[PDB]
Amino acid sequence: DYKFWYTQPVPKINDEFNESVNEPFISDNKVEDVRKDEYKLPPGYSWYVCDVKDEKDRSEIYTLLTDNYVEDDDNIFRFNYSAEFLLWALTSPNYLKTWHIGVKYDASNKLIGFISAIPTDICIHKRTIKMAEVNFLCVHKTLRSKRLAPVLIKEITRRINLENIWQAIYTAGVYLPKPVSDARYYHRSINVKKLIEIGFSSLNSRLTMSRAIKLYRVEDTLNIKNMRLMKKKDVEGVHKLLGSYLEQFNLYAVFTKEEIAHWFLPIENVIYTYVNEENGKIKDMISFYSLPSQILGNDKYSTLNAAYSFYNVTTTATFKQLMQDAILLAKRNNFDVFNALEVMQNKSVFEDLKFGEGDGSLKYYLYNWKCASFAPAHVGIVLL
Ligand SMILES: CCCCCCCCCCCCCC(=O)CSCCNC(=O)CCNC(=O)[C@H](O)C(C)(C)COP(=O)(O)OP(=O)(O)OC[C@H]1O[C@@H](n2cnc3c(N)ncnc32)[C@H](O)[C@@H]1OP(=O)(O)O
Ligand SMILES: Cc1nn(C)c(C)c1Cc1nnc(-c2sc3ccccc3c2OC2CCNCC2)o1
Ligand SMILES: [Cl-]
Ligand SMILES: [Cl-]
Ligand SMILES: [Mg+2]
């Protein structure tokens, strides 16, 4: 019935728009009309302004997400973003502290809910719009289905609107009104035996353990011999190679140089970017971020280390060669599995590179924006 979502400026479940329609649901908004009062929480709970740059506040958010964030369909794996990853995700250029919103239960002083946004320029069907990117919405498991999430969403919308920003982008595995695109995820096994033992992957009578390990074996040599970790000096060249590439898609972020530096310079166990430089020119890039899963109820293993394909561009090799090197560089950095979405050119390499189709998909949404939906090959943004 979507009783909350139907009160919001998003498409109805049946809405379908021509390619010519590309505009807000509600235009001519006025900063001066936005509510100044915080939305009301139930008795005994209060808003909390989180300082993600303080280790202790950042620790509280980490604990909340570690225990209560997203689980796979079978409740065996739960995302386990690290504290340094949350730091990086939330302190991008021109971030606002007041868009990092916690909810505490007054009597324990414990964080029980969270929601965040960062500002990003988003190009949708060739119109660039100042938006908020929303992520890390989470309500403690003990307080589910109490209608707290619409409170968090309405409060962040109010604070975003105070900055004269009236559109947002977000992704969810759940179906809401109404996806602008829908991308399945695929997984390429790296540590086969481990993935079998935790029930991420399976065997069978044809594929014995030894034959499954042989199947996923990779040669420890790069297609692009000079691919190396990105350094500060490469920010200009990355901004030109990526910025040009992305303009073909129907939905992408428009990065400034300061955004390239933030989103790509390598941070161990967070973000890995590699470049191929020729003549002082960046001609190819690979990137992926680290998003481990906590494994629930396995006696031997508690963590699955997973590399998540972010942005990959090649001008000197085939896309298949580039993605093969991405898998190898993930392997060299101790990752058990390489995960990709069917966005950009990704799907075209999944069969040859031995990726397996996963169990669900990620829906891309816009808030207060009406437009034609599109196949995921035309999606040119990867969220965290
Ligand atoms: C202009 C600026 C605009 C800014 C804002 C833009 C929009 C931002 C929107 C947020 C984008 C976040 C993106 C993001 O973070 C990445 S998707 C990750 C979401 N987090 C998790 O799945 C963590 C585990 N789950 C939870 O913590 C709770 O289940 C949550 C908190 C998800 C819902 O808590 P609950 O205790 O289970 O539920 P109630 O409080 O009773 O609330 C039920 C209402 O919530 C609607 N709902 C449920 N899940 C949602 C989801 N993932 N997006 C949006 N809405 C969601 C649901 O359809 C229902 O509305 P309806 O009756 O109409 O159906
Ligand atoms: C696998 C998996 N493990 N777990 C713990 C979950 C809930 C899933 C399902 C899932 N839900 N979102 C995604 C994926 S796969 C992928 C590959 C490359 C880039 C992004 C993603 C992605 O979503 C990202 C970005 C949106 N938030 C979650 C991670 O995967
Ligand atoms: Cl209201
Ligand atoms: Cl482990
Ligand atoms: Mg609730």
Side-chain angles (χ1 to χ4, degrees):
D1 289 327
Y2 312 101
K3 298 290 203 178
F4 170 65
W5 280 106
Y6 277 11
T7 72
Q8 304 297 108
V10 301
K12 311 294 159 175
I13 281 300
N14 281 335
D15 276 348
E16 273 160 343
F17 305 101
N18 306 175
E19 294 255 274
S20 77
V21 170
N22 192 47
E23 57 185 57
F25 277 105
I26 296 179
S27 284
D28 303 305
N29 296 293
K30 304 270 189 276
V31 168
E32 281 331 308
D33 287 347
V34 179
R35 305 187 65 92
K36 293 199 302 237
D37 52 316
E38 298 181 322
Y39 277 92
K40 181 188 166 296
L41 289 155
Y45 297 86
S46 300
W47 298 108
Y48 181 71
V49 158
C50 292
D51 181 2
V52 70
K53 296 202 176 170
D54 181 80
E55 180 272 325
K56 192 153 178 188
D57 270 8
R58 186 175 57 249
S59 91
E60 281 202 301
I61 296 163
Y62 168 75
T63 298
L64 175 79
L65 296 181
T66 296
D67 300 346
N68 314 271
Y69 203 49
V70 192
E71 292 177 4
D72 73 299
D73 303 341
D74 293 17
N75 316 104
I76 292 165
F77 299 106
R78 177 177 323 119
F79 289 143
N80 194 189
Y81 289 93
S82 78
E84 303 63 25
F85 187 117
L86 295 176
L87 179 65
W88 173 71
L90 296 177
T91 62
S92 55
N94 307 313
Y95 75 93
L96 296 85
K97 184 176 157 169
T98 52
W99 288 3
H100 304 160
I101 315 186
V103 171
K104 279 177 186 207
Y105 183 49
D106 304 338
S108 56
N109 199 44
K110 248 69 167 271
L111 190 68
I112 59 76
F114 188 68
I115 193 180
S116 70
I118 51 162
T120 168
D121 281 66
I122 297 299
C123 188
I124 169 77
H125 191 85
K126 310 188 160 211
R127 282 183 76 169
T128 301
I129 301 303
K130 292 280 185 192
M131 303 201 185
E133 179 167 302
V134 172
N135 211 340
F136 307 114
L137 167 63
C138 184
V139 166
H140 198 274
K141 274 170 186 282
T142 64
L143 303 163
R144 299 281 176 80
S145 301
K146 292 163 75 73
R147 314 302 294 185
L148 280 161
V151 198
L152 281 166
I153 292 166
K154 287 190 284 193
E155 183 56 11
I156 208 167
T157 302
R158 187 188 75 75
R159 297 190 196 187
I160 290 152
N161 300 163
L162 288 169
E163 304 305 310
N164 198 34
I165 294 164
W166 299 101
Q167 275 76 38
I169 184 168
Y170 46 108
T171 46
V174 286
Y175 185 86
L176 308 167
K178 179 183 184 159
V180 303
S181 194
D182 191 4
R184 295 168 296 168
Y185 33 82
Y186 286 73
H187 309 284
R188 204 290 183 182
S189 306
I190 297 185
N191 183 346
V192 174
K193 193 152 83 50
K194 175 171 182 178
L195 293 183
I196 290 296
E197 298 188 358
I198 78 194
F200 187 99
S201 292
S202 13
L203 294 170
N204 78 60
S205 267
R206 326 180 240 179
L207 205 76
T208 58
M209 182 66 75
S210 62
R211 279 182 191 139
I213 295 167
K214 184 177 151 72
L215 178 64
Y216 288 113
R217 194 149 51 233
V218 300
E219 165 60 24
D220 195 41
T221 298
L222 295 159
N223 292 136
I224 305 162
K225 55 174 177 192
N226 298 333
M227 192 57 85
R228 58 162 176 80
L229 278 166
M230 187 187 177
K231 295 202 241 78
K232 277 178 72 139
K233 68 179 197 168
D234 304 316
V235 165
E236 170 158 24
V238 172
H239 176 235
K240 273 174 24 45
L241 169 83
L242 179 72
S244 190
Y245 178 71
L246 293 178
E247 291 178 348
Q248 70 187 282
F249 299 113
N250 201 50
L251 179 66
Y252 59 99
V254 179
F255 294 96
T256 60
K257 291 175 177 174
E258 299 84 350
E259 293 171 310
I260 298 281
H262 183 78
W263 290 119
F264 302 90
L265 286 163
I267 301 176
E268 266 267 274
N269 299 134
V270 175
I271 174 67
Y272 291 77
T273 302
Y274 298 84
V275 294
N276 183 41
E277 179 176 34
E278 284 193 359
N279 307 305
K281 303 232 159 262
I282 294 314
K283 293 221 176 206
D284 310 271
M285 73 180 282
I286 287 169
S287 55
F288 43 91
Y289 56 79
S290 176
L291 173 42
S293 295
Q294 181 187 350
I295 303 175
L296 312 169
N298 177 288
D299 298 354
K300 178 176 180 185
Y301 296 111
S302 64
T303 295
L304 167 57
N305 274 120
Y308 280 66
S309 181
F310 193 41
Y311 297 93
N312 292 303
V313 185
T314 184
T315 70
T316 72
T318 66
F319 195 65
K320 182 171 98 186
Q321 292 147 9
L322 187 73
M323 297 305 282
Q324 174 166 238
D325 285 358
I327 295 167
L328 168 63
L329 292 163
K331 183 175 167 91
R332 284 180 176 180
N333 280 285
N334 197 223
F335 289 100
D336 293 321
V337 64
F338 186 94
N339 292 327
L341 293 170
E342 58 164 347
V343 304
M344 299 178 276
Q345 309 162 77
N346 295 349
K347 181 147 218 306
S348 69
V349 308
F350 291 162
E351 196 188 302
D352 285 342
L353 301 184
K354 296 177 184 131
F355 280 75
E357 179 175 2
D359 289 338
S361 72
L362 189 74
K363 290 76 167 168
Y364 277 77
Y365 300 93
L366 299 171
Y367 191 93
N368 186 30
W369 195 266
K370 169 198 291 195
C371 64
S373 64
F374 36 87
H378 295 291
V379 169
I381 186 175
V382 178
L383 284 73
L384 309 178

